[PDB]
Amino acid sequence: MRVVVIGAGVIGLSTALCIHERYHSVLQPLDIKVYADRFTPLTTTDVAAGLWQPYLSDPNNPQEADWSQQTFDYLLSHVHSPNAENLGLFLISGYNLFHEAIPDPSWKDTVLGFRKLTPRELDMFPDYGYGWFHTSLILEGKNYLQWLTERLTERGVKFFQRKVESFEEVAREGADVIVNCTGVWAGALQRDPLLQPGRGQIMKVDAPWMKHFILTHDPERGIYNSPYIIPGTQTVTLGGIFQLGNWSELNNIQDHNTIWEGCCRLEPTLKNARIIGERTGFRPVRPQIRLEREQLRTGPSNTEVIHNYGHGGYGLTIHWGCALEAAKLFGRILEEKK
Amino acid sequence: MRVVVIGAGVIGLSTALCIHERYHSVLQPLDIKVYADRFTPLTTTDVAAGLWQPYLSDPNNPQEADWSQQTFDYLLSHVHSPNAENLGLFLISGYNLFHEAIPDPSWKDTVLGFRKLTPRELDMFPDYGYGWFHTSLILEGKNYLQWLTERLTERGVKFFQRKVESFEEVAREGADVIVNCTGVWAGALQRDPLLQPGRGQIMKVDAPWMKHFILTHDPERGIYNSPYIIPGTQTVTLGGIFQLGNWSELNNIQDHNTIWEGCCRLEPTLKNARIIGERTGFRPVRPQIRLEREQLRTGPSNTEVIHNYGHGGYGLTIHWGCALEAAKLFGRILEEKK
Ligand SMILES: Cc1cc2nc3c(=O)[nH]c(=O)nc-3n(C[C@H](O)[C@H](O)[C@H](O)COP(=O)(O)OP(=O)(O)OC[C@H]3O[C@@H](n4cnc5c(N)ncnc54)[C@H](O)[C@@H]3O)c2cc1C
Ligand SMILES: Cc1cc2nc3c(=O)[nH]c(=O)nc-3n(C[C@H](O)[C@H](O)[C@H](O)COP(=O)(O)OP(=O)(O)OC[C@H]3O[C@@H](n4cnc5c(N)ncnc54)[C@H](O)[C@@H]3O)c2cc1C
Ligand SMILES: O=C(O)c1cc2occ(/C=C\c3ccccc3)c2[nH]1
Ligand SMILES: O=C(O)c1cc2occ(/C=C\c3ccccc3)c2[nH]1
């Protein structure tokens, strides 16, 4: 009853945790190990600020919307436990700014105290004339990945460092079910033209007076290409860069100036704030999340493969709904045994 | 044309700054010096978290309400300058919790995005069933007193350390107009039975995930005697102690337990947070602020005295409206010269 999960990001770790707590009981003996090329603090998850917020128009797959809601409710039911600081979970309020009047989002009632910005609040941001204010959650990837690792290590889950070159290679090794949580690199295991890197560059600035998140939006520049400021526990994330098809895991100077001159137009207080770090990541951009069960009859035996990747810029927002759905698929393989 | 301001708190410093910028011009040669027993970080102002919020029912003096509004507008017009971090000025959102439904405050439209808490937000605080959410400002006393000191030193304002024993003593020294900004100690210069110490004890805790202020209210325990959590730039202020008539400038253990067991019932995450410090202060409690002009014909000449003290637990909230009003009184003495 052995199962291998490939990848140690928010997807691989929550999926591995979900499957356990759903199939661990005496009658069902379960063996699980995780294979990953990179672990915390070197994953994409470690680069993500952790703000809960879906993509903000009607999703192409209505499933996703419920998975986002499932994640929020799960996280909000945790936000006030003394252990919440170990997963880097806290409550944050903030602004979402626009140039034109857009309809209220689907997640309007998922979030806390959602409302439309007043003219006086809008007068604090002089390039934007419409907007929202609401209370969400930040789930810092660094702390959450440590929490999941701890949680998995005490429940008997072994961890291994290796770069998998094919599913057939891990199938001949022993594993019954393979859980594919490779993120942006899934293509190297099974070609996927739909999956593309959504290059992001961030700036980690020391600004503790910064108490709210500010997200800006314009259909002109596109998604994730507009200034954003996201306070964390130890620093403030300064972003607003999205380059599709870009595989450069190198910090670019032109992007630094774009983020800096954009965030300082929002919060001019940021001009006299020290920079602790700059980092780069690739959002696993896919039109839809691939959360489908696939029988790999092309290789060792009739091996089952659970695909779970392509969560773009909302991996931390959606992860739990996915992890539950993946566990549901694992149960379908189990009931269809013999 | 020499004038002495007694006290270096938020009152003494803003008053001294206001008078200058209102009477500094070539035609009006002005000499001003400040006398104080204690300077930053040893004043009451240094103990105050700096949250802008008036006392929250209809004030006995409707003047005060406009002075509070004058302070907010002045501070909000500054909040987005790159210099705002030097006066410890930033924008903060938060909760005001209640056991019963109370009417909305006077300052409801003075603050940003004021609204009444939703049932789901109220379900995060299980001892309180009504409440408000709004966006205010924090003006940290430590940084603001440094900013004022800097501002005054470059405009030619001399500072002196001395404990004044009487107004007649400073009148024989030379000073034409005396500005009395002694706070809780005003009684030692001119007896005031109305002025009393409103003992406060605070706890400075390291909790950066704490992004909102939480103020609790009950008519049972009284004003300032209910748990409060106020995030600052470098730490989080944990309070909820008010002892009228208490002159003990010593941290009490029983009060520590009261604050700790109260703040942890609100935010249980605070249980595993380090304590950087504990401090004590005395709110200059008076039924009304004494901002009256008084001719001291009892002593050297017909010396004029500007009284400006008794700002209780809202000194940082009101200071600017007071400083402007005091400057207005200084102008009345000037026009009534000869
Ligand atoms: C700059 C930036 C900011 C972001 N901010 C947010 C945010 O605020 N809110 C939000 O909800 N989301 C955010 N995201 C998106 C979020 O980071 C992701 O969607 C999520 O982290 C994707 O993680 P994953 O777990 O799928 O992939 P990853 O975190 O990259 O982890 C993938 C795992 O797959 C492994 N892997 C790949 N190929 C192999 C192989 N052959 N063998 C072994 N292991 C392999 C890696 O080794 C790794 O362990 C942000 C992303 C970026 C880039
Ligand atoms: C625990 C606590 C928390 C608080 N939090 C807030 C808050 O969040 N928001 C808010 O708006 N307000 C708050 N306050 C209230 C605020 O601190 C005060 O109302 C304000 O700081 C009062 O300052 P002052 O300038 O009148 O007096 P102080 O700051 O005490 O300064 C008085 C000055 O008078 C001097 N002085 C007195 N006698 C003499 C003498 N004979 N000779 C020379 N100098 C003399 C002292 O030396 C000193 O320099 C808080 C108070 C406490 C105690
Ligand atoms: O750049 C990103 O990938 C990113 C940063 C960030 O902070 C919250 C989210 C999730 C969705 C989102 C992002 C920007 C604008 C609207 C929704 C998010 N995505
Ligand atoms: O204890 C205090 O003196 C105090 C702390 C604090 O934080 C904001 C204010 C100003 C008025 C106030 C205080 C508590 C409840 C309602 C209004 C304030 N006063």
Curated annotation (Swiss-Prot), chains A, B:
Keywords: Amyotrophic lateral sclerosis, Cell projection, Cytoplasm, Disease variant, FAD, Flavoprotein, Neurodegeneration, Oxidoreductase, Peroxisome, Phosphoprotein, S-nitrosylation, Schizophrenia, Secreted, Synapse. This is D-amino-acid oxidase. The keyword Flavoprotein applies. Optimum temperature is 45 degrees Celsius. Expressed in the cerebellum, in astrocytes of the cortex, in motor neurons and fibers of the lumbar spinal cord (at protein level). Expressed in goblet cells of the small intestine (at protein level). Increased in the cerebellum of schizophrenic patients (at protein level). Decreased in motor neurons of the spinal cord of patients with amyotrophic lateral sclerosis (at protein level). Expressed in the cerebellum, spinal cord, kidney, and thalamus. Abundant in glia of the cerebellum and predominantly neuronal in the dorsolateral prefrontal cortex, hippocampus and substantia nigra. Its EC number is 1.4.3.3. Signal peptide: none annotated. It catalyses: a D-alpha-amino acid + O2 + H2O = a 2-oxocarboxylate + H2O2 + NH4(+); D-alanine + O2 + H2O = pyruvate + H2O2 + NH4(+); D-cysteine + O2 + H2O = 2-oxo-3-sulfanylpropanoate + H2O2 + NH4(+); D-dopa + O2 + H2O = 3-(3,4-dihydroxyphenyl)pyruvate + H2O2 + NH4(+). Induction: Induced in cells following exposure to etoposide. Changing residue 38 to H: Found in a patient with ALS; impairs FAD binding; 20-fold decreased affinity for D-serine; 300-fold decreased affinity for D-alanine; 3-fold decreased affinity for D-proline. One of its GO terms (biological process) is digestion. D-dopa binds at residues 53, 283, 313. One of its GO terms (cellular component) is cytoplasm. It comes from Homo sapiens (Human). Catalyzes the oxidative deamination of D-amino acids with broad substrate specificity. Required to catabolize D-amino acids synthesized endogenously, of gastrointestinal bacterial origin or obtained from the diet, and to use these as nutrients. Regulates the level of D-amino acid neurotransmitters in the brain, such as D-serine, a co-agonist of N-methyl D-aspartate (NMDA) receptors, and may modulate synaptic transmission. Catalyzes the first step of the racemization of D-DOPA to L-DOPA, for possible use in an alternative dopamine biosynthesis pathway.
